[PDB]
Structure formats: structure tokens, C-alpha cells
Amino acid sequence: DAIGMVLGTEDVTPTVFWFAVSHGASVGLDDLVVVETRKPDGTPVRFYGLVDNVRKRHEGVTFESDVEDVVAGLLPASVSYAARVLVTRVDPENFIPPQPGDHVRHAAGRELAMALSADKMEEAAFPGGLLADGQPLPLNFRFINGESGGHINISGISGVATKTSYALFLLHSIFRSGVMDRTAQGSGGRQSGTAGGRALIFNVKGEDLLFLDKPNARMVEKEDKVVRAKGLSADRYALLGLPAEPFRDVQLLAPPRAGAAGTAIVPQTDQRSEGVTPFVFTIREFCARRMLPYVFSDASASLNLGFVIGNIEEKLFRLAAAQTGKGTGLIVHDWQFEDSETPPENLDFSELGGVNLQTFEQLISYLEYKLLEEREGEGDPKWVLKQSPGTLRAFTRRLRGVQKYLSPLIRGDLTPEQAEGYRPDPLRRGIQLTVVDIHALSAHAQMFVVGVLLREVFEYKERVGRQDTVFVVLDELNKYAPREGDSPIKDVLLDIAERGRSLGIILIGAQQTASEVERRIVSNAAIRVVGRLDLAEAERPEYRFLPQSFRGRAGILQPGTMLVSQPDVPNPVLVNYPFPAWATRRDEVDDLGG
Amino acid sequence: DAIGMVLGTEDVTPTVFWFAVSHGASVGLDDLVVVETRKPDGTPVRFYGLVDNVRKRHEGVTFESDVEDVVAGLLPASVSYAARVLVTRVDPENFIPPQPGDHVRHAAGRELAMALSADKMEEAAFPGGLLADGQPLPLNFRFINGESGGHINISGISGVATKTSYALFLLHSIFRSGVMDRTAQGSGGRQSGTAGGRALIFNVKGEDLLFLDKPNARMVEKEDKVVRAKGLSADRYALLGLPAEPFRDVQLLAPPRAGAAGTAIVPQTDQRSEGVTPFVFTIREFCARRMLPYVFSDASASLNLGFVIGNIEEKLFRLAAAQTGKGTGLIVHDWQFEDSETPPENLDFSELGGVNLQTFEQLISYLEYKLLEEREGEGDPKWVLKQSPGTLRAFTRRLRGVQKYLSPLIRGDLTPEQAEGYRPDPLRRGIQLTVVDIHALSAHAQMFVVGVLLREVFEYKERVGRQDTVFVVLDELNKYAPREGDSPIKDVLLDIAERGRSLGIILIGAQQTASEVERRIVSNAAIRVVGRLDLAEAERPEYRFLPQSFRGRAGILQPGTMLVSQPDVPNPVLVNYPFPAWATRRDEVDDLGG
Ligand SMILES: Nc1ncnc2c1ncn2[C@@H]1O[C@H](COP(=O)(O)OP(=O)(O)O)[C@@H](O)[C@H]1O
Ligand SMILES: Nc1ncnc2c1ncn2[C@@H]1O[C@H](COP(=O)(O)OP(=O)(O)O)[C@@H](O)[C@H]1O
Ligand SMILES: [Mg+2]
Q1: What is the dihedral of CA B20, B22, B25, B27, to 10 degrees?
Q2: Which residues hold Mg(2+) (chains A, B) (predicted)?
């Protein structure tokens, strides 16, 4: 039943020590063990620890070429199988040394709970993945939902480290474990419900986050091989107390077909058209809800246009509040264009002689007249508050650059019912997971939609309060929150990281290297997960929470294998987690066989 | 009675040396020891120290595979139990080595006092926590009240390290140990009183810092377990000479129900309604006491609005000094609004044709008029003061963005008596502890309240003087005093750190990592305390006061275990402190269970 004995040839310190592996037992690199030592007065002191180094030496072989004789039986040789243990816990916390010869044994039952501080987690423990020998690793939800700890940060080489798919596994674990229930017993209103929970996620890389609403045909065939190979009792999900089933209550939203002058509205998706709902903003919303700054996120040097943008934002806001009509466009009455080079065919003209702006192009043209033509090119003084003409043209030119890409999204030609039906609500009643398909959008349109949608949820939580947890799963954090660049979308993320704990917005974010992301986003994550990391980044300052033992291991980490670090447990523990039950590509949705 | 003997196999130097543990004795890692050696001429020299390394070896084992046989007795081997002693003090200051074979014994009586420099502390020593075996740790109050020492800085993993709970323990020890008396009698005029010691603390994270008035139902069940396990003589509080009771005279202040257009005033309290008093500021107080800059504390790039803020601050200051009325609002006579988009409703129009500003939004609207509409936009040059319109709308817009969150706190509609009663006074007569509930406020409203309150106490001490000690207990020191940002709330924290010693304001600050806080705040902390530190941060330059021997140990410190480092004693000492006698959550007050 024991696994080894504490070695005496090496120093035995309370923090770290070596032990010799017993015959007939194997010790893997990441095994969790427990050793119990006796004090002089006879009181026990238990040491819970994790293996970080493992080796084998040949005892007494002398010259190396003796092996041929040695293994033939001619020369006597003993094999020395040794393991180093990094102590994570001392239950009576006497920092005394164990005695050499104390029995080392695998932490398997309550001993494992003590080894992973599961007593500190209490009911808030939920499946975080599988350990070496099929024992689920317990994550403390109180360090994920804001109660005691913030959000999560996942890192690793894209394509190899499985961060996005792991984040979806964490979502499945959180929704399917009842951990939101158990930890909603904490109080009646501080945080409450497992039904209340919601998740918002964006489909940046094209068509990969759709088919969460269809089961993965391939899961059992790939997962059978793992259960066959590692000799597990069952499929991993059942080991977790998790079901091997896809996401439920899923809302799929996509931009409207990039329709050029077409009133017909259909989503852009080629590979999936069923169950996909188009989402659009309206010109009047755009001005009423102050969406203008979220067009501006350059992730480069640029200038300080904050004055210009702030002024026109307020001008549009008061304009939209002045609108009395039910339409989705913005009616402006002060647009006269003798020779502002726009054509007169298509402008819908109001009953009161006003011009009704129906497309994003018109909204930008009207911004051009007020800023650069209102009075023979010097512009409307009330719109350009003495701002430089160059500064104006930059602003205008960046709006022009993205309007070809953003125009289908922001529509003033729609009628009021179409606008209320197509309006993007990541918090719609009865929906648990909302996927926003921004894959066909441009690098600018993408962060526009991400910007206002995150802001809309956050504004909603400020206004309403914090008894519903909303999960935002965001890949490529560096572009959204760059280390030195300053931007409005970054600002909303700064708001979710720093204030979202007590507001109820949890970020499960991922990036290839945390060193390219804003320090304040990475710093505010209680849970840090590491996939296969780059050999150069492992020694960076952002990954010191990995002991040196772990970087070399972290360079060859296999897909499906992650190192999670959570505040309760002072060491990274390695975990594997099942394949997605949810389809992650089109052919995994095969209703009828292959 | 002895514990070991100085070893002769390792070097014996006066600063560091090893000794062999006697059989039947246990030597923990942080134990305090004394060894006495004899000079050639017969004079004794005492060495007091602290263990920093401890190990066990197998002496006389050739191969590690022999280990199993060794335990049976088949082969011969002896266990070597050795400890390294980091010398902290020599009674006679002679830097001569102790001879191998000198006797090592636990510092237990007067010897313990000599190891912890308690003779330097004199009457100013007070309990700072419990040592390895039940003896209280002396803390030098003179290094906390400003006489020879200053303030306190606590570092550690939030949620695991118990820094907030420890800080309240320090208040409890300071108030209930009569140390304020003992060290007040050196000269009564110089520094006077245990009744004159007060505390101000802020309740940000949850409803966690209310119910400090109420006893903790759960602490006997939790503290019984520790006394049972560690074989201590009594409950830890009795060991310290401290009582297990809550704070004596407490005042709980809360924001006013976020009342929308409601004259009724009630605290925002949802779980604790009894004993909570609402606090409010008045528009007139806002202008008279110069509360304007403290709205602006973004702690980022921001802008140079200091000129704008300084101008409008002085303008509102002279405006308030000109006010003759008894009302709480500000009456301005130069506000005309022919098309300012303002409303025709009750402005409590004055008898003299002036407008009486009663809400924060009105004050911002009047500011918008003077700065952006006065002379059809260019404004009153006694207000805009040649400042650009972009900067002007920026100052305006940031006031607008924050107005919704700060409006319920700043009321000019209140009557003079409601104002004098609801005014927040951390120094109220007959109060020892003041708790400010800002958990319901936004990130901006919180920074505001903390700013003007800390400034109010600081101004009062400048004006009055220093025979009352006021303790400010502040968690999350990284957001309030960032390392690189610059804000007014950081400036009052800087004034407290650099001047608070001789003014009587002592800061008990806590943050996850000292490396994220302003250097000047952390540098002026005479007492540094460390709970479980991040593996990454222990090697940072801000934690060099931890010797390398401690780092690995500090990575795994258990909740309730802290390393205090004080100027008198040259090394960090590990301590344990009781569970809170005061309730720290709702169900702790009245659980009636077990
Ligand atoms: N548990 C797993 N084991 C192995 N491969 C997995 C596992 N889960 C997902 N994958 C696959 O490995 C890749 C996962 O990477 P993904 O998370 O999509 O990208 P990244 O993590 O770089 O954002 C995809 O090929 C995915 O289908
Ligand atoms: N004396 C104590 N010993 C052990 N745990 C304690 C003690 N006092 C409080 N705790 C618990 O430890 C945690 C302390 O976290 P807290 O102090 O609130 O946050 P932080 O330490 O980051 O400021 C909470 O679970 C608290 O109930
Ligand atoms: Mg991805």
C-alpha cells in the first residue's frame, strides 16, 4: 500500500525531500503523495507534497561497460528509483524534518483532499480536470465567481496549447457541476442561482465556435483511445461527475450578409444557416448609446483624438435625444450641401424638410460637413471645438476606413420592429451561452462589436446589480488589452478585471503570452492556467509562478494537458481534461454516419 | 532541559552556525534558541538566534537502495538531526565563535526576551501574535505610533493570506493591551491616552466589515480545534493577555439608499439595518471644503486638468463663502438658460432671483453653462480662464460620467439639521472605531469618499495637533496608491505616510504585492508583515527583507500564519494569531449552531 521510504542520502527538509521508490510501484512526475512522521513526543505530523523530479541510478556498477555482465546476472547491481517531493502542505504545520525511512504513500482519499486544500474549498470545489490517476482536480469557485477570487487567465502556444477549448470545458464544468448552486447557498442575495448564470463568447477565428449546439460525433472515438490507453475506469466526464453532452440554451448571432443596398436581412454564415439569428445596431442607438468611441481602437501610436471623439459623441447624443420620430435613423435638419459632393437621389427626406440618415456612410458624411465644410471648409465651430483640421481628417479618415467594413452592422434603414428583433442581447432571458460571430468582420469591426457588447453588459451590471454571474470568454487578450497601448475596449476590460468581481462579470481570458497583455488584466486573475508554453517565455517575469521544475516540463506539454494554479494550492498541478462534447467544426456534426 | 550541541562538522561562525538535535527533542524551523559559550578567560558570551535550516540525514549509508534494509536493523546507520542557527543577538557584543559541543536550548524566559530585543521595547512591547510554543511576540508600539516607528504594511495572497483579518487583530491588541497607556506616560503632555486612540476603516469588498460590534459565534469551535491540536494551555487570547471580545465603541456609516428624487434618507444596508447611520455630503460643503479634485482619481494617463480643476475649485470656494443662506445648496445668480436644454421645474428659485443648486447634476449643469455656454460658448473668462474647449468638455464629461454614482451622496436638497446629523465624522466624540460602507458605491464614488474622508482627518490633525492617534486600515493599497499613477487620493496617502508619524495618523496598509504600490508609501512602513506570498513576488526587490531561507516556507504558509518583521528584531519571526472574536459575516452573529 505504501509507495516508498524517505531517503537519508539526501537532505530531508520540511519544504522539500527525497524518497526511494518501493519495488512494484511506479511514481510519475506529477504524483501527489503523503508521508506521516512521528515526533519525539509521539504526536504525528503529516506532510503533503507533489513530485517535481524523478530519476533512476545504478547502485554499485562501478565501470559503465559492466552493464552487459551486470544485467546478465554476473555482477550484483541494485536499481535506485528516487523521487523528489515539493511539500505543499504540513497539516500540523510544524516545519520539522521527516525521518528517513518514513513511509511515503499516494494521497488517495481524504489525504488527497488535504493535499489539494479541498477543505478550504468546501462546497465550492468543482471539477477542474483529471489528475494523474483519474482523481478530479478540485477548483475553488469562490476564486472564480468574485466571492474570494477574481477571473481566470489561460496561456499557451496557439494551436498547440488548448486554451479556448479548455475555457469551454471550464464553462461546461461550472454549469454542469451544480457548483453555482452549492456556492449560491453562501447568501440569499450576495450571489445567487445556477440558472442565473450566463456566458458571452465571440467567434474570432472563422466558424469554430458555432456547432456548440450539436454534439461532437468524434468525441467517443478519440476519448475511447485515451480510456483504453491510461486504463481508466470510465470515460473522463463520468470520472468528473460531468455529462459528456454539448452546450444547451445557445444563441447564435451573426452580421447581416454584408448586404449592399439590400433591405433583405440574412446572416453571413455559409456553413451554418439554421438557428443563426442576425444582429444589427441602428444609427439612432449608435448616437443615443454613445457607441462612437468604440470605433476608435487603433492598437498603435495614433494621436490623442479623445477630445474630438468625446465632443462628437456628445453632439450625436443630444441630437439623438432630440429625435422625436420612431425611425431607426437620425434626422438632422442642418445639412445643406450645395457642393459637398454627395448625390441627392437616395436621402430619405423628412416631412419637416430634414434629412434622415439611414446608412453609416451618410452618418460619416454628415460628420464631414459639420467638421470640414459647414462654413466654406472651416467647418461648423460648434462641432469642431477649435480642433486642428488635421486632427479632424484623421478622425474622419479612420471612420471612412472602417465604414466599408462596419456599414452592414449599423443600419438606419431598418424599421423599428426589425431593429428590436435583431438587437444583440447577450443577456436574453432563457439563453445560457451567446456566441457572437465576428469572424467575417474586419480587424476593426471585430473590436467595435466586442467593445460595445462588453460595455453594454457592464453598464447593465452597474445599473442592475450583482446576483447573476456573466462569463466572458475572450481569446487573444493581447489585441484587446495590449501592455502599453491605451484604448476604450481595453478600458472596458480594465473595468471587468478591476471591478467585475463585485459586479458579477467574470473574464475567462486567453493569450499566447501574458507578457504581451496589460499587467492589470493578467494581475487580477485568481486562476492561472498554462498550456504548452514557448521555451523563451517560460523564464519571463510573467511566469515565475511556475517553479523551475515546471518550465522544462511546460515546453513539451501535450495538447489536452494544462497546469492550473489556484490560490488555495501553492503549486501548479498538472491536469488533463476530456475532448469537447460540443462540436468545434462542421464535420463533427454528422447526424447520419461517416 | 537542553536541546542540542554545537556541531563541529560544519563551520562555527559568530553570525551563523549548526548544532545537532539531542535525541527526544524536536527542532522546528522558526524556533528561537540560545547557546552560551565560555571565553578562554572564563567570561561567558551568549548567542541568541533563530533556526533557518533544519534537516535529517542517514549517516553511514552507502547506497540509497540499502535504505529498506537499514530500517530493519540489518545494516548500521544513525539518523542525524541538524539545525542551522541564524544569530540575531550576542549579549556581550564579542564576535567570537561558540565552541563545538556547547549546549543549545530553547529561549524560553528572560532568554526569549533577549532574543526578541524586548529590553529595547520596555513598556512599549505589546502582543503581536503567538510564537511556536505559546509565548506572545512583543511588538514595539513606538515603531507604530510615530515616536520611533511609523505605520504598517501587510503583504500576501488575498483570500489565502489573512492580512485584513490580521490588521483588525492588531487594532484589537493595540486597544485592549493598555500599550497606549504604558507608552503615553513617558510624558502626558507629549502624547496622551488610551481613550484617545481611534480607528477609521473602509468596508469595500462586501458586507464583511459590518458586525464588528457583535461577537463571533463560531470562533470557539474553530479556536478549540487549534488549541486541541497544538496542545496549548488555554485559548490563544488568554495567552496574549488580550480578551476575546469585539470592538467597544463602533459607528457604522452607509450611503443613502441611492434615493432617486426621494427626500427620505435610509442607509443602503440590505443585511444589516440596525445601528447603521446614513452619511451624506452637502453641495455647500462640497464647495467650501474643496471636494472637487477628489472626483478625479483615474490613476492613469488622464490629462493636465489640474489647471481646470484648480480653477473651478477656487471658483466654487469663493461662491460658497459668498453664500449667506442657511441652506445646504449653492445659490448662483448668474445662471440664465435660454436654450441650455435645462428643465423648467422647481429649482427652488431663490427670493432674490437666484437659482439654488440642490442636486449634483444641477451643479454640473451650471458648471457646463459657465464653461461651455456662457457667452454663446466661449464662457465666462472668470471661469474658462483661456482653457481649450476640448479640455473643458473633458473635465465636464468626466463629471457627467461619474454624476449618476456620486449624486445620492452629495445632496443640496437636504435641510440643515439632517445635514449636520448625517455628516461623516471619523473623529466623533465617544467613538473608537468608524466603519465606512462604500461597497455599494462605484469605483469612482469609493475613491471619492475615501479621498475626502482621509483629507478631512489629515486637515483636522494639521490644524489641531497630535495627542490622539488615528489608525487608518486600508486594504487593496495598489488601487489607492499605484506605483506609477498620480491622483489626489494617492497624494493624501503620501501625506499620511511621510508626515503622519508626527501628526498622529498611522496607516495599517495591505496589498497583494508591495511591488505594485507606490515606493514612498511602502518605504515608510516600519512594521512589515507577510502572509502566504506568491512564488513570483518573494524574489522581487520589495521583499528582500525576507531571507532566502524563508521564501520556500512563505510560499506555503497556512491561513492564520504571518511573518512579522520589525526594526528591533533583525529577522522575520513567524507567528499565529487567534480567529476573530468579532463577527466577520452575517451568519457569524447569530448562528446558534454547532
Ligand atoms: N482535450 C484535448 N486534447 C487534445 N486536443 C484537444 C483537446 N481539446 C481540444 N483539442 C483540439 O486541439 C486544439 C485546441 O486548440 P484551441 O483551444 O482550439 O486553440 P488555442 O488553445 O490555441 O486557442 C484543436 O485542434 C482542438 O480540436
Ligand atoms: N485567525 C485566522 N486564522 C485563519 N484564518 C483566518 C483567521 N482570521 C480570518 N481567517 C480567514 O482567512 C481568510 C482571510 O481573508 P481576508 O483577510 O478576508 O482577505 P485578505 O487576507 O486577502 O485580506 C478568510 O477566510 C477569513 O475568514
Ligand atoms: Mg483559439
Answers
A1: -10
A2: 164, 475
Asked if B56 lies within 8 A of A82 by C-beta distance, the reply is no
Cβ-defined contact of A310 to B64 (cutoff 8 Å): no
Where b means 16+ CB within 10 Å and e means fewer, A352-375 reads eebbbbbbbebbbbbbbbbbbbbe
What phi and psi, each to the nearest 5 degrees, are found at residue A210? -95, -175
Q: Which residues of A touch B23 (CB under 8 A)?
A: 40
Q: Is A211 in the pocket of ligand 1 (CB under 6 A)?
A: no
Half-sphere exposure at residue B273, Cβ-oriented, CA atoms within 13 angstroms: 4
Going by C-alpha positions, the residue among A61, A175, A225, A238 that lies closest to residue A431 is A175
Q: Hey, are the CB atoms on A502 and B393 less than 8 Å from each other?
A: no
Q: How far apart are CA A398 and CA A23, in angstroms?
A: 71
Cβ within 8 Å of residue B188, ≥6 positions away: none
Please state, in angstroms and rounded to a whole number, the distance separating the CA atoms of residues B390 and A382. Answer: 12
Q: How far apart are the first and last CA of chain A?
A: 47
CB distance B104 to B2 below 8 Å: yes
SS3 of residue B99 by DSSP: coil
- Measured CA to CA, the distance from residue B203 to residue B291 in angstroms comes to 21
As a whole number of angstroms, the distance between CA A395 and CA A371 comes to 10
What secondary structure does DSSP assign to B259-328, as a single string? -SS--------SS--TTEEE--B-HHHHHHTT-SGGG----SS----HHHHHHHHHHHHHHHHH--SSSS
Contacts of A11 in chain B (CB under 8 A): 55-57
> What is d(CA A14, CA A11) in angstroms, rounded to the nearest whole number?
10
Judged on CB neighbours under 10 Å (0-12, 13-18, 19+), A344 is: exposed
Q: Can you tell me which residue has the cell 537519508?
A: A8
End-to-end CA distance of chain B: 41
| Burial profile A561-576: b = 16 or more Cβ within 10 angstroms, e = fewer | bbbbbbbbbbbbbbbb
B481 touches B490 (CB < 8 A): yes
With contact defined as beta carbons under 8 Å apart, do B140 and B121 qualify? Answer: yes
Instruction: Kindly give the distance from the C-alpha atom of residue A201 to the centroid of ligand 3, in angstroms, as a whole number.
Output: 11
* Residues in contact with A553: Cβ distance below 8 Å, sequence separation at least 6, in sequence order: A29, A574
